[PDB]
């Protein structure tokens, strides 16, 4: 079974979501986020001193 | 034996090819003995003798 969300970017709060699929229980997971990082890409132009 | 007091409820279906249906039927009986089931329309069969 495929199930999709949107999630805002805070950290620090948790979020819930509803599962529902006939014929059987409903089901609910909860989520929550701790880190997210971004990275450049680099090169040398020259140094000084 | 007779039975006098019945309700039908019905907690699920999915019209498949294979048996994809329940129903729970209440009842009051006067003694312990064996009965048979059967159904009174033609779209619809049930397996239990």
């Given at each position: 079974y495929e199930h999709v969300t949107v999630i805002?970017?805070?950290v620090?709060?948790?979020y819930k979501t509803l599962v529902n699929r006939?014929?059987?229980?409903?089901?609910?997971?909860?989520?929550e986020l701790q880190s997210v990082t971004l990275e450049p890409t680099?090169?040398?132009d020259y140094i000084t001193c | 034996?007779?039975?006098?007091?019945m309700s039908c409820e019905v907690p699920a279906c999915t019209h498949s090819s294979d048996?994809?249906?329940v129903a729970?039927?209440?009842?009051?009986?006067?003694?312990k003995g064996k009965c048979a089931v059967h159904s009174m329309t033609n779209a619809v069969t049930i397996?239990?003798?």
């Open positions: 805002p970017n805070t620090g709060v948790p006939p014929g059987y229980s409903p089901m609910v997971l909860e989520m680099l090169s040398l | 034996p007779s039975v006098t007091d048996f994809g249906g729970i039927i209440k009842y009051t009986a006067s003694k397996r239990e003798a």
